[PDB]
Amino acid sequence: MQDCGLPPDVPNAQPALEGRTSFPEDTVITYKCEESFVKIPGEKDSVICLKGSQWSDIEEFCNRSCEVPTRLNSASLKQPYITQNYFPVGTVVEYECRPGYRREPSLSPKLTCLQNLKWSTAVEFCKKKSCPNPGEIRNGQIDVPGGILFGATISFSCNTGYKLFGSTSSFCLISGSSVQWSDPLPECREIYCPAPPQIDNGIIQGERDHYGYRQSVTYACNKGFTMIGEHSIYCTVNNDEGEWSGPPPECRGC
Amino acid sequence: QDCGLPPDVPNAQPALEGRTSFPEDTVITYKCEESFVKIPGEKDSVICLKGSQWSDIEEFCNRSCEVPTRLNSASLKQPYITQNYFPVGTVVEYECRPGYRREPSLSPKLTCLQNLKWSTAVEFCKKKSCPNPGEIRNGQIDVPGGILFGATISFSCNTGYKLFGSTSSFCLISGSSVQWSDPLPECREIYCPAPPQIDNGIIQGERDHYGYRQSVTYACNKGFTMIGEHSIYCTVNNDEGEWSGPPPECRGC
């Protein structure tokens, strides 16, 4: 009769029959691979009801493959693997470094699909690029806690008696073709104490324009006056603010 | 042949030894009364001569000031320093003791006044001053009460420095002048012991010497995690250099 019966049973595939058990001549039935199965590129996936109530032949067209290679931050799949989804056991794909990573020549940038349907062990075939030498800050310091490679952070500080002007930290970030420091080297600026206080009936011996950390100012009483106190005071510096060590002496008469 | 009582001399009293009759050739001496001093080169005694007659004697006492009171700034000059006769109007001169100097604008002279007292005293001899103390590098000099003869000054070293030498000085008299008993001490920077090294970590840019408030930053080798403070600083546990605390540790991952 001008109708075929049920289509052939294909291992690991299920046909779309759409609610019927009898099919008219020239009816085309497509199969869909089952769970944990991928169709093999370049193979038929359907059958056709021919004359004599006979279905056309169809061979197993499903496998049996790894999952899409897991997403790496250091490397991206090369073409044509990056667009593929069929990876039977034995399949080897190649990677290429992302930015800002570079190849570690001693290591292979390839992954193989193993018999257990898993990709081989991952190695660091693509390593983190290095930022330039951070250099130095005059009268300050740079803190490099964990190297200067891509993704690293470094902090800046100013020695006692100096004030930091600029950025307090920097990060090695990707910059176009390479990796560069997010911020430039800041500045350590000398902290100045307020102008030293003047005293009644006394003077400052050779007063200077500016006074920095630990610099001193010496006092002297005028003729006929007696000194009572410290002959000199010095500049103390804390939390970036200058302050004299203590009060100036007194010149009492007479 | 015995004389009777000797003559009455104004402002003087004779030594009779409780006698009322005196034999020929008896010599009687008089002593000036309170506030009076005998006039140099004058007779103070009489002698019983023939005819039961005493020899003549004239007033020999003048009201006099007392010997000037001792001053600590100056001393009487010669010849006043050996004198005891100072009638009204008498002026004596002083000269400075050590360690005192003359105050040019003033007179170093005292006058015996009509009331038998010496004129008002002024500071004609003033305390000498020791030389300006100077400065102590990284230290301080406390001058509590001037730098004149007898004064004391103390020395101290700023935070992070240790005093080597004298802790004080006194203005002493030295021969022909006044000088500080002790020379200035030196304020030397205190250094902390060499910072400790850590396993699997390094000291970022180590220095040869670390002073007060100076820090050392640590960094762990690739593949280790730092446990503890990243940097430590040189404190001064008087008067010694000591690190603020232990260095961090590096744990292998």
Written as one string, the DSSP assignment of B190-244 is PBPPPPPP-TTEEETT--S--BTT-EEEEEEPTTEEEES-SEEEEEEETTEEEES
Torsion of CA A154, A159, A162, A168, to 10 degrees: 10
Question: Cα–Cα distance between B234 and B213 in angstroms, integer?
Answer: 5
Q: What letters, b where the CB count within 10 A reaches 16 and e where it falls short, cover A86-112?
A: ebeeebebbbebeebbeeeeeeebebb
The pair phi, psi for residue A218, each rounded to 5°, is -100, 135
Question: Cα–Cα distance between B85 and B120 in angstroms, integer?
Answer: 20
Overall CATH class of domain B1-63:
mainly beta
The answer to whether B50 faces chain A, any CB pair under 8 Å, is no
The answer to whether B41 faces chain A, any CB pair under 8 Å, is no
Block residue for tokens 């100013």: A158
Which residue of B132, B140, B144 is in closest CB contact with A228? B144
CATH 2.10.70.10 is held by the domain B191-253: yes
User: Is there a contact between A126 and A109 (Cβ–Cβ < 8 Å)?
Assistant: yes
Question: Cα–Cα distance between A131 and A174 in angstroms, integer?
Answer: 9
Query: Mutation test of the interface with chain A: which of B123, B135, B143, choosing the one with the most A Cβ atoms within 10 A?
Result: B143
> A192-254: what fold?
Complement Module; domain 1 (2.10.70)
Question: Cα–Cα distance between B253 and B21 in angstroms, integer?
Answer: 132
Block residue for tokens 């960094």: B219
As given in the structure block, the two tokens for residue A79 are 């073409």
Cis? peptide before A100, omega within 30° of 0: yes
Q: Which residues of A touch B145 (CB under 8 A)?
A: 226, 228
Q: Which residues of B touch A160 (CB under 8 A)?
A: 213-214
- Across the interface, do B222 and A144 touch by the CB < 8 Å criterion? no
Which residue of B140, B142, B146 is in closest CB contact with A226? B146
**Nearest CA to A67 among A118, A133, A121?**
A118
Torsion of CA A54, A58, A60, A66, to 10 degrees: -130
- Across the interface, do B222 and A141 touch by the CB < 8 Å criterion? no
Tell the CATH superfamily of the B64-127 domain: Complement Module, domain 1 (2.10.70.10)
Q: Which residues of B touch A232 (CB under 8 A)?
A: 135, 140-141
Which residue of A147, A234, A245 is in closest CB contact with B222? A147
- Across the interface, do B230 and A146 touch by the CB < 8 Å criterion? no
User: Is there a contact between B166 and B154 (Cβ–Cβ < 8 Å)?
Assistant: no
Region of residue B230 (phi > 0: left; psi between -120 and 50: alpha; otherwise: beta):
alpha
Query: Mutation test of the interface with chain A: which of B217, B221, B229, choosing the one with the most A Cβ atoms within 10 A?
Result: B217
User: Is there a contact between B165 and B185 (Cβ–Cβ < 8 Å)?
Assistant: yes
Within 13 A of B183's CA, how many CA atoms are on the CB side? 3
Equal fold, A65-128 vs A129-191: yes
Question: Cα–Cα distance between A24 and A14 in angstroms, integer?
Answer: 20
**Nearest CA to B89 among B58, B105, B65, B108?**
B65
CA distance A236 to chain B (A): 10
Beta pairing partners, B250: B226
User: Is there a contact between B152 and B144 (Cβ–Cβ < 8 Å)?
Assistant: yes
The domain spans of chain A are 1-64, 65-128, 129-191, 192-254
What residue of B is the nearest CA neighbor of A220? B132
Question: Cα–Cα distance between B197 and B176 in angstroms, integer?
Answer: 61
Question: Cα–Cα distance between A186 and A156 in angstroms, integer?
Answer: 8
**Nearest CA to B90 among B121, B74, B125, B66?**
B66
What SS3 string covers A116-139? CCCECCCCCCEEECECCCCCCCCC
- Across the interface, do B141 and A231 touch by the CB < 8 Å criterion? yes
Q: Give me the DSSP letters along B42-63.
A: ---EEEEETTTEEPP----EEE
Query: CA of B194: how far to CAs of A9, B1, B36, B208, B209, in Å?
Result: 83, 113, 85, 8, 7
As given in the structure block, the two tokens for residue B216 are 């050392």
As given in the structure block, the two tokens for residue A242 are 């200058």
Torsion of CA A159, A165, A168, A170, to 10 degrees: -110
The pair phi, psi for residue B80, each rounded to 5°, is -55, -35
As given in the structure block, the two tokens for residue A11 are 């291992």
User: Is there a contact between A146 and A128 (Cβ–Cβ < 8 Å)?
Assistant: no
**What would the CATH number be for the domain defined by A129-191?**
2.10.70.10
CA angle B237, B240, B245 (to 5 degrees): 55
Question: Cα–Cα distance between B195 and B248 in angstroms, integer?
Answer: 12
Q: What letters, b where the CB count within 10 A reaches 16 and e where it falls short, cover A167-193?
A: eeebebeeeeeebbbeeebbbbbebbb
Method: X-ray
What residue of B is the nearest CA neighbor of A155? B217
- Across the interface, do B143 and A218 touch by the CB < 8 Å criterion? no
**What would the CATH number be for the domain defined by A65-128?**
2.10.70.10
As given in the structure block, the two tokens for residue A244 are 């004299």
Report the residue numbers after which chain A has a gap, meaning the C atom sits over 2.5 angstroms from the next written residue's N, or none.
Answer: none
> A1-64: what fold?
Complement Module; domain 1 (2.10.70)
CA distance A96 to chain B (A): 25
Question: Cα–Cα distance between A232 and A235 in angstroms, integer?
Answer: 10
- Across the interface, do A144 and B204 touch by the CB < 8 Å criterion? yes
| Count, residues in chain A | 254
Overall CATH class of domain B128-190:
mainly beta
Which residues 205-234 of A have a C-beta within 8 angstroms of B?
214, 216, 218, 220, 226-234
The answer to whether B250 faces chain A, any CB pair under 8 Å, is no
As given in the structure block, the two tokens for residue A77 are 């799949």
User: Is there a contact between B250 and B227 (Cβ–Cβ < 8 Å)?
Assistant: yes
Question: Cα–Cα distance between B117 and B95 in angstroms, integer?
Answer: 20
